[PDB]
Amino acid sequence: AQNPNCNIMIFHPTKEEFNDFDKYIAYMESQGAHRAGLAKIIPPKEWKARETYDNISEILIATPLQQVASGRAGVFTQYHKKKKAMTVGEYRHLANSKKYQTPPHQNFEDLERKYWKNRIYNSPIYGADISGSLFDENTKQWNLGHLGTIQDLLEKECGVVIEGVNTPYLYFGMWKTTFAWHTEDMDLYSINYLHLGEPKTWYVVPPEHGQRLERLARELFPGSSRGCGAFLRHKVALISPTVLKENGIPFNRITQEAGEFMVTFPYGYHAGFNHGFNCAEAINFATPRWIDYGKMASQCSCGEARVTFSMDAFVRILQPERYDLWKRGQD
Ligand SMILES: O=C(O)CNC(=O)C(=O)O
Ligand SMILES: [Mg+2]
Ligand code: NI
Ligand SMILES: [Zn+2]
Numbered sequence: 001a002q003n004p005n006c007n008i009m010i011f012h013p014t015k016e017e018f019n020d021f022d023k024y025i026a027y028m029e030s031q032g033a034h035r036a037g038l039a040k041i042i043p044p045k046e047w048k049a050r051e052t053y054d055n056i057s058e059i060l061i062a063t064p065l066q067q068v069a070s071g072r073a074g075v076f077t078q079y080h081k082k083k084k085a086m087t088v089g090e091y092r093h094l095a096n097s098k099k100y101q102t103p104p105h106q107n108f109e110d111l112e113r114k115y116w117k118n119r120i121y122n123s124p125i126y127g128a129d130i131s132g133s134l135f136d137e138n139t140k141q142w143n144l145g146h147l148g149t150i151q152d153l154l155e156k157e158c159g160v161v162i163e164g165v166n167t168p169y170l171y172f173g174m175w176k177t178t179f180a181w182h183t184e185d186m187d188l189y190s191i192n193y194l195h196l197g198e199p200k201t202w203y204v205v206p207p208e209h210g211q212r213l214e215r216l217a218r219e220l221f222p223g224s225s226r227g228c229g230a231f232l233r234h235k236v237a238l239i240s241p242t243v244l245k246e247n248g249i250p251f252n253r254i255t256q257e258a259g260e261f262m263v264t265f266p267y268g269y270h271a272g273f274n275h276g277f278n279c280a281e282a283i284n285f286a287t288p289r290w291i292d293y294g295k296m297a298s299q300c301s302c303g304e305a306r307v308t309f310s311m312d313a314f315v316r317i318l319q320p321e322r323y324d325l326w327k328r329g330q331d
Contacts, residue, residue: 003032006206008039008252015044018141022148025189025263025287034289036252037268038204041261043142050136053196056279057089059170061127064091067178069120074240075220076120078178083125088172088279091127095174095277100124102175102198102276108255112201115273116240119176127172134170134195134281142261144168144193144283151310153286160317164310168283173200173274180235181213181271185307186314187297188284190264192256198276200256203241207267209250216247233300238271266293294318301329 003009009031013024024041033039065080086094094100105111133145140146149166175198184190194200205213214232218225221237228234244251256262258278264270266289286294295318299305307330316323 001032002030003035006035006037006208006250006252008036008204008254009033010040010042012042013044015046015141018044018047021142022287028263029289033263034265034268035206035208036204037206037265038202038252038254038270039263039265040254040256041263043259043261047139047141049139049193049195050134053134053279056134057087057092059088059130059132061086061088061091061130061172065126065128066123067126067176068123069238071120073117073120074243076238077221077224077236078180078238079236080126081123088127091125091172091174092277094125100174108199108201108275111275115176115201116242119178119273122176124174124176124178126174126177127170130170130172131167132170133168134279142193144191144281147191147283147285150188150284150286151313153288153290154314154317157288157291158317162313162317164313166284166310168281171280171282173197173276173278173280175274175276177274178238179270179272181217181237181239181269182232182235183210183267183269183297184264184284185311186318187267187293188286188290189266190282190284192262192264192280192282194256194258194260195279195281196258197278198274199258200272200274200278200280201253202256202262202270202272203244203251203253204264205249205251205269207265210267210269212249213269216244216249228300228302228304230298230300230305231302232269233298233305235305266290267297291318299326299329301325303329306330
């Protein structure tokens with residue numbers, strides 16, 4: 001069995017290997033990369049996402065989100081308070097202000113210590129979930145707006161044609177902006193490209209151990225667990241690496257830098273934070289190996305998790321017994 005300790009693997013494809021996206025994902029899995037839940041892909045030196053980032057300041061962040069925490073430093077939830085619209089130029093200036101900028105630090109480990117010590121005492125503002133792309137249309141390799149769609153994968157594997165579309169999303173971050181513990185919708189893959197700016201630190205639980213994280217979360221968030229049998233789908237709960245180690249939960253960590261791709265694999269729980277002003281692009285995708293995870297994915301029916309139009313069909317075809325109840329949640 002390849003990668004039996006479930007370590008995060010780092011790949012350096014050549015320009016020739018970068019041509020065929022599906023084939024390279026399958027290669028990485030042949031080496032055991034999926035067992036970690038997360039892999040890093042460093043593009044060949046010949047590749048670029050676009051020519052420059054000099055002209056992005058007029059992108060609008062229609063609904064910036066202030067991430068307000070409750071709890072203790074290592075075990076907390078966050079809620080998203082909606083703020084007034086601002087441009088990416090306005091948000092970058094805000095991120096760099098004395099109230100929100102990254103503190104002085106020695107290295108990524110010192111900054112990680114500072115994040116876990118102090119996160120709860122501040123409320124950073126995240127420009128998340130913005131439909132769009134920063135890849136140049138002429139970038140032919142690993143262009144996250146030109147991937148094969150999940151609807152087409154389902155159709156190719158299972159024969160059923162379904163409605164829905166699959167497009168990328170932009171994320172503009174600042175120091176302390178936080179992504180809560182989650183798997184993807186319908187336990188899909190994700191791919192995330194850090195276009196510019198400061199790093200993003202990730203934490204991940206191997207897919208084979210995901211239920212250990214769920215059991216800890218039910219213990220640590222006992223009211224939320226009674227409310228919803230899949231409350232991690234709400235994407236609000238944080239648990240620190242120190243707390244995970246104290247409870248014996250297997251996990252790994254890695255820091256993504258500008259110019260690097262990360263891939264999350266089906267049922268790989270992940271969480272993390274941004275080091276300072278940055279911009280990432282991400283999208284969900286599927287392979288043949290996803291189908292069995294999609295069939296088994298948990299679902300939130302309490303009404304909180306509220307998701308895309310295109311998840312309807314995935315539930316309806318892969319999980320017809322759950323369909324009715326899930327759809328009641330969404331209406
Ligand atoms: O970058 C973020 O805030 C969160 N991203 C993801 O969870 C991902 O790419 O799957
Ligand atoms: Mg612009
Ligand atoms: Ni994710
Ligand atoms: Zn729920």
